[PDB]
Amino acid sequence: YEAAATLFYTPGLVTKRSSHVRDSVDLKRIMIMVWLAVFPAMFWGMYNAGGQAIAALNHLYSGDQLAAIVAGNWHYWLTEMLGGTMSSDAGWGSKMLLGATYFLPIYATVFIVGGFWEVLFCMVRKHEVNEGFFVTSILFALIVPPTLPLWQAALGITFGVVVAKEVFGGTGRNFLNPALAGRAFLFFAYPAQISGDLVWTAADGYSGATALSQWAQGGAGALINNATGQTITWMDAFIGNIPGSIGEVSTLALMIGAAFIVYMGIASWRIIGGVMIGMILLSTLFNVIGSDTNAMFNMPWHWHLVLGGFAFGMFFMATDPVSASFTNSGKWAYGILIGVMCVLIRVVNPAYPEGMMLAILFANLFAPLFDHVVVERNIKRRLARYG
Amino acid sequence: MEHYISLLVKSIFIENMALSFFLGMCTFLAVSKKVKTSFGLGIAVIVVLTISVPVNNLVYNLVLKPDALVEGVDLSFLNFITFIGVIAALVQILEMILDRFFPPLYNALGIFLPLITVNCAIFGGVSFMVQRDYSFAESVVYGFGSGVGWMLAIVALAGIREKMKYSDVPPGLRGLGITFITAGLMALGFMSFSGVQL
Amino acid sequence: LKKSVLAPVLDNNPIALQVLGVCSALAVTTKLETAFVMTLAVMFVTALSNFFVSLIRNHIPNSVRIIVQMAIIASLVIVVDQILKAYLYDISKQLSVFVGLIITNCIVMGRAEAFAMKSEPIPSFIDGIGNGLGYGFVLMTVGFFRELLGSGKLFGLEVLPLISNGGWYQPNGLMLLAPSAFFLIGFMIWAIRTFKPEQVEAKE
Amino acid sequence: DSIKKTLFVVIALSLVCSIIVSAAAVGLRDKQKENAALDKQSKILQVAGIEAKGSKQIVELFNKSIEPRLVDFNTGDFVEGDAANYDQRKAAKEASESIKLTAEQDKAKIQRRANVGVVYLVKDGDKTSKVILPVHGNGLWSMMYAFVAVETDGNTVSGLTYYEQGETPGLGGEVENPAWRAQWVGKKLFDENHKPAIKIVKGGAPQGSEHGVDGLSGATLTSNGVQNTFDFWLGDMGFGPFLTKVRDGGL
Amino acid sequence: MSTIIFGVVMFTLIILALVLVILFAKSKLVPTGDITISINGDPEKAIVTQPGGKLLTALAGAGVFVSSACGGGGSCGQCRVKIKSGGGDILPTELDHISKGEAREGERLACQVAVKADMDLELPEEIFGVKKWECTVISNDNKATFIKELKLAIPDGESVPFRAGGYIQIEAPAHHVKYADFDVPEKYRGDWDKFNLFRYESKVDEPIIRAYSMANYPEEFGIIMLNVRIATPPPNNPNVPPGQMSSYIWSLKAGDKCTISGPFGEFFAKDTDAEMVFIGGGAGMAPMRSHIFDQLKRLKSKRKMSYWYGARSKREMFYVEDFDGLAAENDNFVWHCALSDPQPEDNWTGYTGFIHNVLYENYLKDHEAPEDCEYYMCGPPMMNAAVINMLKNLGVEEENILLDDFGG
Amino acid sequence: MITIKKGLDLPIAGTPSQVISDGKAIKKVALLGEEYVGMRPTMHVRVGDEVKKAQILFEDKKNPGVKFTSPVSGKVVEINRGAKRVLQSVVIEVAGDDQVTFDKFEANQLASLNRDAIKTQLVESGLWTAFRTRPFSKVPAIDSTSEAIFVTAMDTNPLAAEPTVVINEQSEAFVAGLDVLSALTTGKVYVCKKGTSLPRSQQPNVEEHVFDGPHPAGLAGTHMHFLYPVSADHVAWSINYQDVIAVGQLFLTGELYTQRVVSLAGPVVNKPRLVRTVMGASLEQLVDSEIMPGEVRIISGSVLSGTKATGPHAYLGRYHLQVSVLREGRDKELFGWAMPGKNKFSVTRSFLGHLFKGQVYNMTTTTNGSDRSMVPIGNYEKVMPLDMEPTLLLRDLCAGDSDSAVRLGALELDEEDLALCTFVCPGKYEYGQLLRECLDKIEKEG
Numbered sequence A: 001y002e003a004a005a006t007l008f009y010t011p012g013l014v015t016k017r018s019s020h021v022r023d024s025v026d027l028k029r030i031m032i033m034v035w036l037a038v039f040p041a042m043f044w045g046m047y048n049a050g051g052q053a054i055a056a057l058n059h060l061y062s063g064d065q066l067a068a069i070v071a072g073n074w075h076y077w078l079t080e081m082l083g084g085t086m087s088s089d090a091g092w093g094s095k096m097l098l099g100a101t102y103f104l105p106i107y108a109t110v111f112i113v114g115g116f117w118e119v120l121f122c123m124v125r126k127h128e129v130n131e132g133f134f135v136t137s138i139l140f141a142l143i144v145p146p147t148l149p150l151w152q153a154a155l156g157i158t159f160g161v162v163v164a165k166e167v168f169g170g171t172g173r174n175f176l177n178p179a180l181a182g183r184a185f186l187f188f189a190y191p192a193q194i195s196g197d198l199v200w201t202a203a204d205g206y207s208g209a210t211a212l213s214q215w216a217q218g219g220a221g222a223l224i225n226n227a228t229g230q231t232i233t234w235m236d237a238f239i240g241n242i243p244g245s246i247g248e249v250s251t252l253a254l255m256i257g258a259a260f261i262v263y264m265g266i267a268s269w270r271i272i273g274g275v276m277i278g279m280i281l282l283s284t285l286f287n288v289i290g291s292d293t294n295a296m297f298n299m300p301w302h303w304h305l306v307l308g309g310f311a312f313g314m315f316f317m318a319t320d321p322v323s324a325s326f327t328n329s330g331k332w333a334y335g336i337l338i339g340v341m342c343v344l345i346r347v348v349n350p351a352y353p354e355g356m357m358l359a360i361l362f363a364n365l366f367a368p369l370f371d372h373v374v375v376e377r378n379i380k381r382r383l384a385r386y387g
Numbered sequence B: 001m002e003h004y005i006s007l008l009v010k011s012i013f014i015e016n017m018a019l020s021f022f023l024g025m026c027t028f029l030a031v032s033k034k035v036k037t038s039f040g041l042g043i044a045v046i047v048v049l050t051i052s053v054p055v056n057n058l059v060y061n062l063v064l065k066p067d068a069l070v071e072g073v074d075l076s077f078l079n080f081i082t083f084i085g086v087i088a089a090l091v092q093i094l095e096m097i098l099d100r101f102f103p104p105l106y107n108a109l110g111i112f113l114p115l116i117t118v119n120c121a122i123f124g125g126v127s128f129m130v131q132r133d134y135s136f137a138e139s140v141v142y143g144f145g146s147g148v149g150w151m152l153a154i155v156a157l158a159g160i161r162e163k164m165k166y167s168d169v170p171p172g173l174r175g176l177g178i179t180f181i182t183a184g185l186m187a188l189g190f191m192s193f194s195g196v197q198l
Numbered sequence C: 001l002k003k004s005v006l007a008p009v010l011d012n013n014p015i016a017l018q019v020l021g022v023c024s025a026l027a028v029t030t031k032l033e034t035a036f037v038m039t040l041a042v043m044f045v046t047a048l049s050n051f052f053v054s055l056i057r058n059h060i061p062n063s064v065r066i067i068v069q070m071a072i073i074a075s076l077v078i079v080v081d082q083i084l085k086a087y088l089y090d091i092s093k094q095l096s097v098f099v100g101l102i103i104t105n106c107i108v109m110g111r112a113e114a115f116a117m118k119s120e121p122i123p124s125f126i127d128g129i130g131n132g133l134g135y136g137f138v139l140m141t142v143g144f145f146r147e148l149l150g151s152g153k154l155f156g157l158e159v160l161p162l163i164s165n166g167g168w169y170q171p172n173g174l175m176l177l178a179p180s181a182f183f184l185i186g187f188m189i190w191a192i193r194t195f196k197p198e199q200v201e202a203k204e
Numbered sequence D: 001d002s003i004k005k006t007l008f009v010v011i012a013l014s015l016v017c018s019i020i021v022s023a024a025a026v027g028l029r030d031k032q033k034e035n036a037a038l039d040k041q042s043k044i045l046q047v048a049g050i051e052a053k054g055s056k057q058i059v060e061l062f063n064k065s066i067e068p069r070l071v072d073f074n075t076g077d078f079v080e081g082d083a084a085n086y087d088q089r090k091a092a093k094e095a096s097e098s099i100k101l102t103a104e105q106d107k108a109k110i111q112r113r114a115n116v117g118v119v120y121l122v123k124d125g126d127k128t129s130k131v132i133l134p135v136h137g138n139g140l141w142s143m144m145y146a147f148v149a150v151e152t153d154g155n156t157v158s159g160l161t162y163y164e165q166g167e168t169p170g171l172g173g174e175v176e177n178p179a180w181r182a183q184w185v186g187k188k189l190f191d192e193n194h195k196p197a198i199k200i201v202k203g204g205a206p207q208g209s210e211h212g213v214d215g216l217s218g219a220t221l222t223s224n225g226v227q228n229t230f231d232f233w234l235g236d237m238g239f240g241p242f243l244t245k246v247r248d249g250g251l
Numbered sequence E: 001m002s003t004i005i006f007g008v009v010m011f012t013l014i015i016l017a018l019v020l021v022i023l024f025a026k027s028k029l030v031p032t033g034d035i036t037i038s039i040n041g042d043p044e045k046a047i048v049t050q051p052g053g054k055l056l057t058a059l060a061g062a063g064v065f066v067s068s069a070c071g072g073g074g075s076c077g078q079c080r081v082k083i084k085s086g087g088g089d090i091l092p093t094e095l096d097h098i099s100k101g102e103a104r105e106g107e108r109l110a111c112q113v114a115v116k117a118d119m120d121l122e123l124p125e126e127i128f129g130v131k132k133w134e135c136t137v138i139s140n141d142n143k144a145t146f147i148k149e150l151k152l153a154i155p156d157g158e159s160v161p162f163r164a165g166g167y168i169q170i171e172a173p174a175h176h177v178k179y180a181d182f183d184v185p186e187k188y189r190g191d192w193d194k195f196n197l198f199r200y201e202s203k204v205d206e207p208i209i210r211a212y213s214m215a216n217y218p219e220e221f222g223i224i225m226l227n228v229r230i231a232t233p234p235p236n237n238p239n240v241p242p243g244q245m246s247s248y249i250w251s252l253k254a255g256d257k258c259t260i261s262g263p264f265g266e267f268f269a270k271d272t273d274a275e276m277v278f279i280g281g282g283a284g285m286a287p288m289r290s291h292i293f294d295q296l297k298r299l300k301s302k303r304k305m306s307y308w309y310g311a312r313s314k315r316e317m318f319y320v321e322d323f324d325g326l327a328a329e330n331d332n333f334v335w336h337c338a339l340s341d342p343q344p345e346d347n348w349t350g351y352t353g354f355i356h357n358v359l360y361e362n363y364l365k366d367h368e369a370p371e372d373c374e375y376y377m378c379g380p381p382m383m384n385a386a387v388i389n390m391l392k393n394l395g396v397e398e399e400n401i402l403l404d405d406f407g408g
Numbered sequence F: 001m002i003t004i005k006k007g008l009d010l011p012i013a014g015t016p017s018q019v020i021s022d023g024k025a026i027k028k029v030a031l032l033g034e035e036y037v038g039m040r041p042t043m044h045v046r047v048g049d050e051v052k053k054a055q056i057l058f059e060d061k062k063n064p065g066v067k068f069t070s071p072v073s074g075k076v077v078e079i080n081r082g083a084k085r086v087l088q089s090v091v092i093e094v095a096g097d098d099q100v101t102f103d104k105f106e107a108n109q110l111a112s113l114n115r116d117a118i119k120t121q122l123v124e125s126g127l128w129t130a131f132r133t134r135p136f137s138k139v140p141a142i143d144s145t146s147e148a149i150f151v152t153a154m155d156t157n158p159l160a161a162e163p164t165v166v167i168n169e170q171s172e173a174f175v176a177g178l179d180v181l182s183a184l185t186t187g188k189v190y191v192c193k194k195g196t197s198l199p200r201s202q203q204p205n206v207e208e209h210v211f212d213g214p215h216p217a218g219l220a221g222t223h224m225h226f227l228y229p230v231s232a233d234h235v236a237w238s239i240n241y242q243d244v245i246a247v248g249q250l251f252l253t254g255e256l257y258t259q260r261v262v263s264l265a266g267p268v269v270n271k272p273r274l275v276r277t278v279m280g281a282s283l284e285q286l287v288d289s290e291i292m293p294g295e296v297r298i299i300s301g302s303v304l305s306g307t308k309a310t311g312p313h314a315y316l317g318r319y320h321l322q323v324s325v326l327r328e329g330r331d332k333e334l335f336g337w338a339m340p341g342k343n344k345f346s347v348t349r350s351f352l353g354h355l356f357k358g359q360v361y362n363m364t365t366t367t368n369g370s371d372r373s374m375v376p377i378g379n380y381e382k383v384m385p386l387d388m389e390p391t392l393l394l395r396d397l398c399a400g401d402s403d404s405a406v407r408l409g410a411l412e413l414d415e416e417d418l419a420l421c422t423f424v425c426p427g428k429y430e431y432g433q434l435l436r437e438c439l440d441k442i443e444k445e446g
């Protein structure tokens, strides 16, 4: 219990040397502020998962077929037992229940396994357990589909934490994104539970495409919700009434949560603006050249923003301080490369419906080169005695 | 111009000589501690590959192609020895030309030339060329692009390894193990261009 | 005697310590059959090349030494290739480029330069055999792990029944891809340098 | 005068090594050719339904039961040539004996079609009971090659097999699954109006349908490739006129 | 059979074309002119040799040999060459031994510099007179339990000019050795037989080279004096090959001769009015005796001096009468000893215990300024480390501590 | 006018009132042996031996000729030595008024003096130790000459004094010191000041430059960066304004000037103000009956870069012109890291304290948080006006890398220049110590 008592209490220490007064900020407050910022997205994601599942279930089955389906899945009969209802007229509470029955087991598994690995490493190397794993665990739990198996979540958090982060030294001593590295482990290794048509609506027997997969097949006319029967307007993808990953769907809630940590100085408005610039430039160029066979060549810049996991990655995952560039001039190039590669993998890569994590991994590989270019340009000034 | 740009971009990004094809991983993983040395070695590799691939294309199409010399003869079993001989001889002659005629460029990039006298990347480039039956211009462009991709990859690895002066690596993983894991993560990142059929 | 044979397996390993030899190790370890054939070919070629360079170690002209050594190595590799395409046609189709890349493999040339030029014939055959033994230790371990966890088979024989043919196992996809070999060799180096701390590299 | 020594040594070494190399490479040439051919022979035997094992039995049964022939894709009439040695891929590559396809004709993204194709007439006795048509089209990660066995009537299918697919082992490489391949036995290529009618149904095919087979699950981008392969090769630029001649009579 | 002939002809002709183009590019694109190396820039003698080769090899061919233990490869790093113009690039293999200072003085390591062009370097003036000698063994009596004193006599009665603390390279041909050859007096043959060291044996079949430090100040003439320790195999791993050169020097008796080469060294005292403290033990008594005797008899110095020795028992210490005479003739000199495990027979009335503890407790503890003195140190590694740590804790600078490491 | 835009003006309670009032009587002085960089002393005094004013107390081994002289006359009562016999202080009971006197000149001929004569007089009197050299912040050799001397006529430290208040008291001594410095320097003299008016020297050699902005600007490092960039080849000296007044009084009267005007201020000082004192005065005797009851920390210098004055180091430094007293905080808080900070200062905007402008904070000596690895959210760039990449240089200092830090600009920095980067670090690093480590290694590998 004393090990957790390090979290509840301040350390109660004094300074030893030159700077006798210290700033009020620490790493704990930064990590908990980034952890609290994704709560609106988490809650709307649970709500949307429940609502999409209920809609798809009521579209397929009716009457006596519904009962045999809700008595077959523990999510459904546990909602019915706790108090909700799986009928077509369920309120906002019966949908958040069904979304929590999907999200909370994944979050629990991810947290437990990642914390086990982190405590193991910190014990073996005689350190203190660190925050900043809260962020990794919540982001990994929020960037996966609702129908992911728990053993795959365990394997993925193990890979993301041990290999990408803990092997290199811990928090602040790695060069890559742990959450995206774990998610990339599960996408290339077991790629049928994280792709296709049957993994994004947690309904039993429902096959339905997303929206960056309906756009690639037939354009903006092909954006129709089969479960309900109506078109996916722009305000649907912006607000978030679209199927997809758990906590990515609501661009409005992501903006509401990211404006705070951008105001506070924790996230980088330079990287965010760079991502936006790269996306707008490349999407406008594609719209200018245009194509006949490829329907993604005409997706505007404001459709790229609300579809897929672009906003989530731009706000919370592309602003990682350790993986990004350490120079103000390099952060712009980092963001521009992220946006450019995202749009490129979206449009001209046929096998992946999006590339918002492959882009970030590429930019993680190439950020130290931008820092090197800028610092080598800075050294030439100092040799000329003007800096 | 539409067909030669495609080959350049493909050889640079879609099929990277180092991270996609795994050619030259010994010097890649050994000589990549400093961005300076990695840049020099990448430039040397670019030059040698660009000079080597088209000459082997000429020799193949002139002598070693089936039925090229006389009708009914096939000398394709001399491919390996002819390629390795041409590569080694070109590397040595380039070393001597740089050492005598141009001392500055020799002190710049010739220092790395004894390493890539017989490297797997250049032999694999020539082998892929004889497999894909490129013309002379296609061979020039493919060699240039492959060298540029190899240089980009090794410079990125050197930049990462220089950023990792702040890390705290376990003792058993210090050096070679962590370099292997780093190159693995770099390949995981470079897997972005998998589906692009350019 | 025997210790000169078995030193490269653990004490001075090619892929683990003398970085020479990573290219084919990253590639031909998807299947244990190809890993075994590559092991045998590398052992044979290294041993024979060391033997011949030792036989003619005195009369090699220093000016064109590389040409005179590459002649022998490339002739041995060419003969090996022409024998593989006749009697093992399936393995060569999966080994296509790395059969010819044995010439530029670094083990074969490093053992010919550092050892064969300054040693007798009989010890040079033994040096080649030992370095091939270490090479094959690495290849076989990585290939066992990759083919077991990535396809559920060992040497083509079903072990863990895949879910596609009425089984309980769902194979990994990374064990058939690029990064997995890097991670496996890195963790193998970690395990090796845990038991033998004399190989641990210095902080500087 | 040190040049004499290096010249003599290099010449002796080159003579020995080159004699060995040229004696080895030329001796095993026919063995290599046989080993190359037997793979395709065994694949065709498997597609045709004949059971064989071992090189000797494979060769014997192939020379017994299978008779390759050439066909002109334009008119569907047999052409004279050595079908056992025809190389259709190099033929399609070469510009003299291949035609280029326009983007509206190139349904399967092959971009080049050879003039003369090869077909393997299965026969027991003098009568021919089957025909094996090689078809191919682009998938998502590579070009996929096939062997479709069409019966004598020219409509029914007796089996399919992809020997060269190269797609992800568990999403779209399920074209090599025995269940999916057995789904093909009994389907009818053409409808009553002599038009292509093979359909890859996304979501599973109606139980007992004659024209439709199930798609791959998680792979609609390599089920599209299969459907386009069959649409093109059963069309006017493929085995259309040949299958028409087969249906009319005189196989 | 037709293809075999074409294969043979084409292989031969391709190999000929490649070899001949390499020879043509090598003959024309390499000058291969003769270079003249200015041994010393101003003296007119110079070495004319083909450009191919190495600097140390050309110097050894011309007779000038540096005190290197490498023979190629830069193992230890004793060689020091100062070039003004020559080998331009400073190699990373020597950058380990050279700091930022000599990089501005222009020095390099000899094994790393390759002769490719005319160079002019400034060898140290003292290197000219390093003439090697071969001298007869006079006496080889055992002066300690594991240490034996060796003496050789120079022809012409010219004791080679060398400062106190230098060392010679002594080298020998192949030989077969057993511990039944040399004489061992009973006092130490006691423990010798107690641990039956005669079970050991060795056989060297190649020439060998080792270095040893002289125990005679310059004024003593005609004789070369040194103390050599036997390299008895460590009890941890006994079956290993025993000390080859040590066992050979031990097997040596009167009448035979060996080669003594080079009056060079590095462990020479600095000359100020700073108090000296000589900390030596084990086999390292020889350079300490050299230093003390030089400073006392040759220079007639009056600076306050001290000598602290270490030994396991009384039978191991020596030159006692000489040091008593020195301390009696000069009052400024005062020396002490310390025994780890003294014996009952000796009736010891002296300090006992580790020498660092003894020195610190007795002498420097009450000292008004322990950092003013300068300390000379030579002996076993444990003694070295212990006294180094004691002096550092006391606060003595690293500048004052001149350390000589036997085999390190 | 050079305007510094990136910096931080710490709001801390207890700003002094710029009125000079006499100080409490001091009976002990000292020379702190551990503030002189790279010094190893040779003592010329014994405990219980009477001394004079400007009498040598010890000398340098690494810098032959530099003499450290006594501030006042009396008796040496303590020579404190810490761990490894390192010198801590030489305490002198104040008694008598005897002194060593030197040659005195007129106001006219101060500029026409000999450089070597000025050098020897300063060395003998002990004022040579008022100079420091960038790089390495060491006392200049008695043989070397510099082409740029930086006089610091401004003070922007937290709770610092007003240089104009002092210089308006002895304009004559300031002008005399500036003339002496213009006679001593080979190239030039740079008097760095704020917009307010100061006395001016009539020499074409002395140039006045005006700086403006928050406080990285009062430090001589910013002045050197913006007016005369230093490196291994170009070395510049730095002296403050009170030491220039001392130099002027020395060359005008013939007797060392040891009086100082320091600012005693802090959150726990009952009445902050400027108080007169003597060089090296005892802080515990200076600040008794003047602090609030409880547990406090007495600092010699500012809160950014000072010395904790406890025991043997409880005396005024040679380069410190203020005393700072503030309470020590050691309370463990329930969720104090998660409380919205109405009374918490940060350069980040994650607390509510930034919403209230013009607020002052009663700051304790607590380190808010615990030691953790560096996560660069961008706080170092907000407080570094120099032309460097802060995060990369600080990581090069952390990683123990000397060559890269020197390439990135370590040779321009002092421990005072990284005090704000230490201040605003989330990982609670201390970069002055790492900078001194790298600079020591660079001094050695020379």
Ligand SMILES: Cc1cc2nc3c(=O)[nH]c(=O)nc-3n(C[C@H](O)[C@H](O)[C@H](O)COP(=O)(O)OP(=O)(O)OC[C@H]3O[C@@H](n4cnc5c(N)ncnc54)[C@H](O)[C@@H]3O)c2cc1C
Pocket (backbone or CB within 6 Å): E167, E210, E211, E212, E213, E214, E226, E227, E228, E229, E230, E231, E232, E233, E234, E237, E240, E241, E242, E243, E244, E245, E246, E247, E283, E286, E405, E406, E407, E408
């Ligand atoms: C500058 C200098 C000055 C010196 N001055 C003196 C001097 O004045 N007096 C003096 O007595 N010595 C002196 N020495 C030491 C001496 O020259 C040698 O260090 C050594 O004692 C004799 O050389 P050697 O041929 O026996 O070495 P080696 O034969 O290489 O070493 C002999 C010892 O090493 C052990 N050994 C070697 N290899 C192994 C192994 N693999 N495993 C286990 N044990 C092993 C042997 O068991 C034996 O005990 C000096 C050394 C140097 C460098």
Ligand SMILES: CCCCCCCCCCCCO[C@@H]1O[C@H](CO)[C@@H](O[C@H]2O[C@H](CO)[C@@H](O)[C@H](O)[C@H]2O)[C@H](O)[C@H]1O
Pocket (backbone or CB within 6 Å): A276, A280, A284, A287, A288, A297, A298, A299, A300, A301, A302
């Ligand atoms: C708040 C963050 C920053 C905001 C920044 C705003 C920058 C906006 C950049 C505008 C660039 C051009 O603006 C964009 O032009 C493209 C192509 O020209 C238009 O595109 C339109 O025409 C093209 C061409 O027929 C069609 O393929 C496309 O489907 C259609 O939308 C977009 O509708 C418009 O959004």
Ligand SMILES: Cc1cc2nc3c(=O)[nH]c(=O)nc-3n(C[C@H](O)[C@H](O)[C@H](O)CO)c2cc1C
Pocket (backbone or CB within 6 Å): A030, A031, A034, A132, A133, A135, A136, A137, A139, A165, A170, A171, A172, A173, A174, A176, A177, A178, A179, A180, A261, A266, A267, A316, A317, A318, A319, A320, A321, A322, A323
């Ligand atoms: C704005 C901000 C964004 C972060 N984003 C991520 C992320 O996307 N994935 C992750 O694993 N950790 C993230 N972290 C936590 C931390 O940066 C991460 O552990 C570092 O990459 C070092 O491991 C973030 C931290 C902050 C302050």
Ligand code: FES
Pocket (backbone or CB within 6 Å): B023, B024, B025, B026, B027, B119, B120, B121, C020, C021, C022, C023, C024, C104, C105, C106, C107
């Ligand atoms: S295999 Fe050794 S370098 Fe490519």
Ligand code: FES
Pocket (backbone or CB within 6 Å): E067, E068, E069, E070, E071, E073, E074, E075, E076, E077, E078, E079, E109, E111
């Ligand atoms: S001894 Fe190794 S270099 Fe001279």
Ligand SMILES: [Ca+2]
Pocket (backbone or CB within 6 Å): none
């Ligand atoms: Ca292709």
